Every structure is written in C-alpha cells, then in structure tokens.
Design a binder for this molecule. Structure first.
Ligand code: P0T
Ligand code: P0T
Ligand code: FZ4
Ligand code: FZ4
Lengths: 619, 619
C-alpha cells in the first residue's frame, strides 16, 4: 500500500551544536514559522551533510522538506519556504533541493512545483521558479498515469498540470517568465504534449467540454504569438497520433467536433480550419480543411474512427461534417463497385444453389462438373480475400466479415471431401449453403430503403440471446439426465439422454407428450418432474421476454441513421483499398487552395442549408 | 459542379492608355476604394468596349463587376458602386449594367438587386433603384427553385425576396418609391405571386409560423391601400391554385388555419373572412366565408385536402372549423345514401353467400339461376362503378377502394367461367366470397361507435407486415431447398420442395415434427438444421414483436378522431358526385349575405362553445 504524500495524523516513516532531527524540522516547517529555523546551518556544516540527504527525507517516497513546506501552505503563502531555500543555497549542495523529486514507484518525479501549481497559489509558484527550478520535471509515477482505480492523469508537466486545472495566471507565468521559460513544445513520457493532455481529460459533459474547448483555444492562441514557427497541432506522440487523431481514437466527441470546425476571425485566422466563403440566407458554403481527415494519407481520422476505436460514440463522429459530406462523396463514386460485387456474389450463390440442388446421389454431367470447378475457384478466391483482410487487420460490424470466411472455408473443405470420395461432402456443402444465404444479409448495407430498415429492425442484442440459450441448454441437459435416471425400471419412452433431451425440447416449439406412460414403475414422479420442467421453462421464457421489452422501452431511436452511415463508411473505407490482386491507386480528394499567409492547404467545400439558424439571426 | 458566386480564396475563371484587365478591376472593387478607378473611361473609349462585355465578367456564370461590388459590401456601404454606375452611364452602353444578370444554368437571372436586398442594406438598395434598375427581374436558376439538396426557394422577385427575409423597410421602399414602383400583382415563373411564396416557405414551427403570419397580414394590409381595385388573394398560379388552396395542398397547417379564420377590426374589416355576429357568455356564433371552401365550385379546399394531397397533416385540417361544421352538415344530410348503399351491398352479399353455399356439384334450380343472373348483374354494375372511380381519379384510405374492383372483377370472371363450363368457376367464386367479407369492413366508417373503434384498433402498419412476410418467406424457401438437398439418400419425409416448405412452415402455427427420421443417411444433420431453423424463426418473430411494441409505446392517441373524420370526409366528397348513372346536382351551401362594402359573400354560421376562453376573459 502506497503511503499518503502528506497526512496531519499519520506521521512520516524512515523506512527505505544541538542535534536537529528531521522530526523537529518537519514539525517547525509544518506549522510555518521562520524564527525556529536558526541553528540549522551550523548543524549542517558541523555534521557535513546536506538538506536533501537521506536523513532529512521520508525514505519510503523521497519527499523533501520543501514539499512538506508547500503541502502545508496556509492562505497561499508560507513564511518558511524562502529561508529554507536560502539556507539550502548556503549549504552548497551539488544537487539543488528546489528541483528535488520523489523516487518511489507511486509518486515518481513528483516535484514541489507540481504541488505549488495544484495548490492554486501564484506566490509559491513565483518563489519556486525565481529560485532556480526547472519547469520540465516529469511525474512518471503510477499515480499520474491513466488507469482504472485511483489516478489523476495530466500531461506529467508543470505547464500541463497548470493547463488541466483551469488556472490562467499560472499558465501565463510559466509561459512568459524571464527567469525560466517553459515551452508548449515540451513533451512528457508517452509522447504527449499539452494539447494532448487536454484531450485525454475531456468528457462529454457540457461543463468539462466548455472548459477544455476554451483552454485549448487559449493555449493555441498563445502558441500563435510565443512560438509561431512551429505547428503545435502537428506534434506526434509515440503512438503516432496528433491531437485531432487522439480525440478521434479515445471517443471524446465534443473537443473533436470543436477541433474539426473551429474558426477565428481576425489576426488568428491562419490557424483556423473552417473557412466560410459565401452565404445566402440559409445556404452557407464553407471550405473545410482536409489535413489528416481523408484516407489518402496514412492512419487518419476516417480510418481511426472506422477501425482503431472502441467506444459507444464512434457512430456519431461520422454524421458531423465534414465527415458526412466526404463519405457521401466517396459513396456516390464507389457505389458501382459495391453493386458489381453484389451481382458477382449473387451469381456465385445462384450457381451454388443449382449445384447443391440438382445433384446425383451417391451434357448435364459436364455442366455440373464445370459448376463444381467454378464453385471451387470462387471459394478459394473468397478465402484468399478474407485471409488477406484478417492479416491486414491485425465488433458487430465485423460479424459478417468473419462468416464469409466460413462460407469460404467449409466450401473448399467440402470440395476436397468430394475429391476424397467420402460420404460427408453432402452435409457440409449444404450446411455452407444455409450459411451462405445468411451471408447475403450483409449486402443490404448498400441500399437506403432496406439499409435503414435493417438497422431499425435489429432490435435485439446478440449476447442476451447467447446467454439465454446457454442457460436454457444447461437446464435441458440437467432435466434430461434426471429423466433418464428416473425411467429405467419398467412397469419405452425416454431411453437415451439425447432422446430425452429432444422430448424435453419439444415443449418449447409447442408439442409435448405429458401423459402417464403406463410402462414405468415411477410414472407419477415422471409426470410430476415434466410438470416441473414446463413450469420452469415458462418462467425462463417470460423473464427473457420481460427483459427484452424493458430494454426496448427506453432508448432513443435516432441512432438508426447514424449506425447505417457508419456501416456504409466502413464498407467504403474497405473498398477504397481495392481487391487483393488489383490494388486501387488512392485518389486525393479536395482542391489545393491558398487561404491566408503562402499557406496552401487542401480544402473541401460543403454546402449546408439550415433554416433554424437563419430564423435566429433575423430580427 | 457549379462555381460559387463569390469567394475570397478561389479566384474567378474566364471559362465560357494603360491596360486595365478584369483582374485588377475585381481587385480594386473588392477592396472598395474609388481613387484607383481613374483611367477606366479613357481605356474603354479607346478600346471601344463596354463594361458589361464578355471581357469584364466571369464567363462561367455571367457575374458583372457590380455584383462583385455588392457582394463585397462592408458595413452596408461601398464607395465604389456609385462611381462604377456613373462611369457605366458615361460609357454609353445600350444594355445597362445596373440590371445585368447571370446567364449560367445554376444562377440564371440573379441580378444585383437580389444581392443588395439579401445583404440587408437599405442604402445599396436605394443606390441601385435610383440609378434605373427594374424591380421585376426573375431569378430562374435551379438554385432558386424548390428541390431536394441545396436550394433557397423564394418567389423569384426582389419584392418576394424582401418579403421572405422579414425586412420591412426594404419591402416599403420597393412598394412606394417614386423612381421605380413595384407591384404585389407581379408574378414570376410557375405563376406564383408574392403571397404564394410566403406560403411555400412556411413551416409548422411556431417561430417561422409567427413570421409568415405577421408578414402575410402586413402585405395584405399594404395591398389594401396601394392597389384596392384588385383582389390579391384570388390570383391563380399555373397549377390553378390560390394562396388558400396552395396552403391546403402543400400541408402547411399554420398559415392555412390563419388564412381560414383571420379577422381584422376597423377599416380593414372587408378583407376578413371570420365575422362574429353575436357572443353570449361562452357561446359564440361566427359567419365564416365559403369562398372556395365548399365543393360546389371546381377544385377547392375540401377536394384538395381529400384527394390532391400527400402529407402527414392532411388529417388535421379537417378537424379545424369551418371544415368540421361543413362536413358534419354534409354528413347529416348524406348519411341516408350511405346507409341505403350499405343495405344494398349487404343484400347482394347475402345472395352471393347463399348461391356459393347451396350449390350443386359438377323451383330450386330456377331460383339458383336467377341468383346467378343477379350476381352477374351486380358484379358488372360494381365493376363499371369502380372503373369510373379510377378513371375520374386520374393511399391507405384508397386501399378498400381497390378491393371492390377485385370483388367485382373475379366475380364476373368467375361467371364467364361458369358460361365456359370449365372446372375453375368454383375456386375463384368462393375466393371472391372471402374477399367480399373483408370488403365489408370499409362500411364500418359510417357509424360512430364502431368507426372510432376501427380507427383505434388499426394499430399495425401494413408495410411492416409485408416486409416481415417477405423476409420470412425467403427464409423458408432457402431452408426448404437445403432440406430437400440434404435428404435424398435413404438409410420418406421431405420429398419435394413444396412439402418441405410446408413442413417447415408448420413450426410457426405450432405443430412441428422434430425427430430422428430413421430413414435418412444424414438424419442427425437434418435434425440439427431443423433446430437451426426453429432457433432462427424465434429470433425473427421476437424481433418483429419488439419492433411493433417499440413503435406502439411512444405515440399520441388523439389522432383517432381526426383520422375517422377524414375518412368520413372522403366518403362524403365521394358520394356528393352521385352514382355514375344518376349524377347528383350539386347543391350550394350557405347563404348570400352582405358584410361591409356592396360586398355580397357566401357565408356559413358556426356556433362554437368553449368554456376555457370565457374563463380567461373573466377577471
Ligand atoms: C406465470 C407464469 C410465468 C406461468 C404461466 C403458465 C402457468 C400454468 C404457470 C405460471 C407459473 C407460476 O405461476 C409459478 C411458477 C413457480 C412455481 C414452480 C413450482 C415447481 C411457475 C410457473 O410456470
Ligand atoms: C431468446 C430467444 C429469441 C430464443 C427463445 C427460444 C429458445 C429455446 C432459444 C432462444 C434463442 C437464443 O437464445 C439464441 C439464438 C441464436 C443462436 C442460434 C444458433 C444456431 C436463437 C434463439 O432462438
Ligand atoms: N352494437 C352492436 C355491435 O356494435 B359494436 C359497438 C357497440 C357499442 C360501442 C362500440 C361498438 C361493435 C362490436 C364489435 C366490433 C365492432 C363494433
Ligand atoms: N423494393 C423491393 C423490396 O424492397 B424492400 C423495401 C422497399 C421500400 C422501402 C423499404 C424497403 C424490402 C422489403 C423487405 C425487406 C427488406 C427490404
């Protein structure tokens, strides 16, 4: 268990002229008086130690006397910090105590400047900075990393901590002091910068969103005038993302939306992304920026939303522009490939159904052999394509992206059984055929009127059905074992465990026997136990029905269009790569315009019409 | 792709003493200074060109320099417009540049006056009008026409555009200027007048409704004093409608309600429609106006609501008065025809059932032959009536209006089979019989206690059932093909595709086999595939049930009375024409009263009692 960093009740632990112990030092510093600090210098120069040694620190963490001074800050000002740092300078230690930090696993690197910044005191921050404290000390402990349980994640920097805490004066003093200037370009471990730490502390609540949007714009505006020669929104962390991509991956929708369509009028225009070129009543035409939003480059916002994301908000980022217009422009160009692919799959499935039906038992024979050869070639091509897709991609939207493989694999496996002349090529093949018709359902995603209907009608969750089936199946097996064990002595029904399981399952499709057998010694108890099974199956079925109804009473129904748009987006980004043998050359979208200053950016126009805002701007 | 009409970033395109190119002209006009316009006149008189030629315009659209001047309007005033028009006048061109307009397809006819009116600047409008610009220039491009996608529909006139934008000062200046007076009577393409364009931009939202009601009343009041000799609410567009009928057709309920019962006290009384004659406590008697609201004339509000309308708000216009009282007065007079028609149909159906039941296999014989003759005559009369109804009418309310035809057609077709002595007159006839009993259900619309019950009990949508049946039927056919293909090799059930389809459908009515067949080589896989079919049919049925319940949970239930009133209104307006052989003379309803001034109007009194408003007017 990690010790607390300061505690008024639990004392510190030493576990790793006059005598002046560390306990008296902590006692006089915690109260906060400088008169009783006399005699420290003479004692240190007699014992030939330094104030940052192992004697004067909590050995379990590494907390020095200065951090106890700052942690006992009363009314924002401590009168002991200045003489303590002065006598530390007079001691002549090589390692300065102002920038000392802990060495424990929990609070590694946690300096005094972080404590002074968190205590919302500009005076202690000024006293620490003016006495030679570096402003790039990283807090690398487990307590300052994003994980479940007890943690407070910030960007492991004094400036990041000042940014996450909404205090503006401390951010300004760190950014433009003469004694020790910080930098917005400085990075911690995991590669994050201060524009990343704001994104990773965002939330979908409106207050936290307003906080992080305001402070993100503020830091970007100060980065415009402090270090204009560097693009602050293009520095990459160790995963390879940028702040826009990191907003896309984590599921933070609000700061992602604000970053995607921010606009500042005036001198701060060159760092905008949404430029409006004309507007006529309700219609407004805006030139959005496709820098790392299109799929022509490497991992971008579209692919990160499509594949590398696990969040319930991955279906609402697609709807907001300029992702909606971009994916609509991609779909209106690549719908022909989808329809031709669907027609080829339908022709392959028709020839499969013909071969499976008109088949001899164990010109027409030559036609059927050509059909078998064509089925084998189609199955091996589909198998190669699906194995390519999995190997490149190294969850319900991927559901139909695995069954294809089964409809491939079984098929080719069935055909090698046909080449082995066994008596099992007929089940697996026709089993494949059943799966194949189910596998056609994915191709409803390409048409509007049936795609919206499919997304609207999928009103049950798969995990609920697969849990209920498992519970009912264990129930059936247990009662089947009991019924076989009960009916062994004659005065025959329920002879084996499988037959008794079938005759028990027959009560769910609606045809059960339920009578005196007149062949069993214990036929009354058999009837009683069957009555118990019926009365329990009805409770289980009613519970499942009630649970599904309670699930479907209270949810919003507007997500149908968003989910359909996401499914179409995944299919578009899949087809944009091309086939595994005819790799499609990626076509850059947008036009290279000149906005501001020679600032040449890729731009993409969208024409949005909205009568409500136009009615609002009217008198 | 159409080019933008102005764009600060994308430059214009030429695609269709000192030199003074069009690029320098656009550069100096866009900034907005007049000092650098010097030397233009000498250059134009040396090169013998004009300022509106092809050289000085964006050839892709036809945009002139003046429209670039107005589109770069800063703080409402440009100092360049006045010298530009002055030097255009000094150039001596035959075609004036002030009223020049585009010639592209997308922005056809879009003048500078439209831009100045949209920019909400009275000063630029005054400068354009005073320098000789006609006020009847029509914007005929696709961008200014009502269609899906990107469009801004107004009445293609400067006055209509000033009317749709809620600005009052520009409307007044266009209406009463001495330099170039506009007119409320002027019409664009599609025949619309200014009062029509207000209706076609209306909406059911309260803010837009309040805007359009206020501005409609305002323009009507100004039309009272500018051009009193013309009725502004009687001009017909090219479809033949008036503003009231256009409000009825499009589904705009709020402006339709306001137009139907507007009243102004004082000097503006003669243009009202609802006159109150007396009011005593709560009861109030009002003389509404039946000008184009009754069905005695040509296409009126009642017929346009009844037939020529496709909107979800066609069942709420009937409930609001004076349509409610009018249709109640029609129904209380024409209920006898409905009941006599129902009794005649019931007698015809009883004789049909008797003939279908007491029929010999392949005095009583003469009676049955007379019954057959009467069935043939009734069927041919009903067929002639229904063919008349379709040919004159050249959707669920029309559903029962087609099945009659089938109950006609099959019947007469069955009888000609009886005259052909074939072995198929017995199925079709009795099939007709079944349909006819279903065809009786439409006649529940005439009685209150069962009509409200029928409208209340119709709680399912037909398209959902017809989609679910299609999905389940494809499912059944696919599994039937698989089951026939699997069971071919003996060690018999499931022999043909139709029999296997029937034995698979038997799991839905609640009687399935589900056992080891002991006759098939692959009987275990047959059992497994039947289990798969059962487990999938239950998922599909549960999904359909959940979807219907979710559609049922969250909806308003007050629409039963409105839908029943609409159905009764459709039946009344159908019977008012009369039979196809005894065309009923149309009877004018209301009385010819004299209200205001000799203003003789058809009027219809309604007695409305409402305790709530009377409680509000009390202290
Ligand atoms: C309302 C339910 C869920 C069913 C509806 C069908 C009928 C006949 C019985 C009801 C029922 C009970 O009312 C109570 C139990 C629990 C007692 C089990 C004793 C072994 C089971 C049980 O199926
Ligand atoms: C709760 C439902 C919808 C039914 C209720 C009746 C019973 C016995 C089974 C349930 C059920 C599953 O719980 C899961 C599936 C999907 C797995 C199919 C495997 C081929 C189907 C499936 O009918
Ligand atoms: N009064 C004789 C039956 O009328 B029905 C009826 C009677 C009173 C109130 C409402 C309806 C009726 C019964 C079943 C279906 C439809 C109508
Ligand atoms: N148009 C032919 C059938 O299309 B379907 C359809 C038609 C119109 C609107 C919506 C869907 C369809 C029917 C059942 C299931 C899925 C789709």
């Amino acid at each position: 268990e990690p010790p607390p960093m300061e505690s008024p009740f639990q004392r510190e632990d030493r576990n790793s002229p006059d005598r002046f112990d560390r306990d008296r030092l902590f006692s006089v510093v915690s109260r906060g008086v400088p008169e009783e600090l006399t005699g420290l210098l003479e004692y240190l120069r007699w014992n030939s130690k330094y104030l940052t040694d192992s004697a004067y620190t909590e050995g379990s963490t590494g907390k020095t006397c200065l951090m106890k001074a700052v942690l006992n800050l009363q009314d924002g000002v401590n009168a002991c910090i200045m003489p303590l740092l002065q006598i530390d300078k007079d001691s002549g230690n090589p390692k300065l105590l102002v920038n000392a930090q802990c060495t424990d696993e929990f609070y590694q690197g946690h300096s005094a400047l972080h404590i002074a910044i968190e205590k919302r005191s500009l005076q202690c921050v000024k006293l620490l900075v003016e006495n030679g404290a570096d402003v790039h000390l990283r807090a690398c402990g487990r307590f300052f990393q994003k994980h479940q349980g007890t943690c407070f994640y910030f960007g492991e920097l004094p400036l990041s901590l000042a940014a996450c805490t909404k205090q503006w004066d401390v951010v300004t003093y760190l950014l433009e002091n003469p004694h020790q200037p910080a930098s917005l370009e400085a990075t911690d471990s995991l590669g994050n910068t201060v524009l990343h730490a704001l994104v990773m502390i965002a939330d979908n609540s409106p207050e936290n969103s307003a906080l992080v949007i305001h402070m993100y714009d503020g830091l970007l505006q100060m980065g415009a005038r402090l270090c204009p020669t560097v693009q602050l929104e293009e520095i990459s962390n160790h995963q390879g993302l940028t702040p826009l991509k990191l907003a896309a991956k984590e599921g933070k929708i609000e700061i992602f939306r604000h970053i995607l369509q921010r606009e500042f009028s005036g001198p701060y225009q060159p760092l905008s992304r949404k430029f409006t070129e004309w507007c006529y009543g309700p219609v407004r035409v805006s030139l959005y920026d496709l820098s790392s939003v299109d799929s022509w480059e490497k991992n971008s916002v579209l692919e990160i939303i499509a594949f590398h994301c696990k969040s319930p908000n991955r279906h609402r980022m697609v709807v907001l522009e300029p992702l909606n217009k971009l994916l609509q422009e991609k779909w209106d160009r690549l719908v022909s490939r989808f329809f031709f692919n669907f027609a080829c799959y339908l022709v392959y499935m028709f020839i499969f159904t013909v071969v499976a039906y008109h088949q001899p038992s164990l010109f027409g024979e030559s036609m059927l052999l050509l059909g078998h050869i064509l089925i084998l070639l189609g199955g091996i091509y589909l198998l190669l394509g699906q194995l390519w897709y999995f190997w490149r991609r190294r969850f319900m939207d991927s559901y139909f992206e695995i069954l294809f493989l089964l409809q491939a694999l079984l098929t080719v496996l069935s055909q090698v059984l046909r080449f082995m002349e066994t008596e099992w090529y007929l089940p697996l093949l026709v089993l494949s055929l059943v799966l194949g018709w189910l596998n056609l359902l994915y191709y409803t995603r390409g048409f509007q009127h049936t795609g919206i209907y499919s997304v609207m009608i999928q009103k049950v969750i798969l995990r609920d059905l697969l849990r209920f089936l498992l519970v009912y199946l264990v129930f059936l097996f247990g009662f089947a074992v009991a019924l076989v064990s009960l009916s062994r002595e004659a005065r025959a029904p329920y002879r084996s465990i499988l037959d008794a399981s079938l005759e028990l399952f027959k009560f769910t499709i609606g045809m059960g026997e339920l009578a005196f057998q007149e062949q069993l010694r214990f036929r009354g108890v058999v009837l009683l136990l069957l009555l118990a099974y019926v009365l329990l199956t009805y409770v289980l079925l009613l519970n499942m029905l009630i649970a599904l109804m309670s699930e479907t009473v209270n949810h919003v129904a507007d997500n149908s269009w968003s989910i359909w748009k996401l499914q179409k987006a995944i299919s578009v980004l899949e087809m944009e790569n091309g086939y595994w043998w005819c790799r499609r050359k990626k076509h850059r979208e947008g036009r290279l315009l000149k906005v501001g200053t020679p600032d040449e950016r890729w731009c993409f126009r969208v024409e949005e019409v909205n009568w409500a805002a136009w009615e609002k701007t009217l008198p």
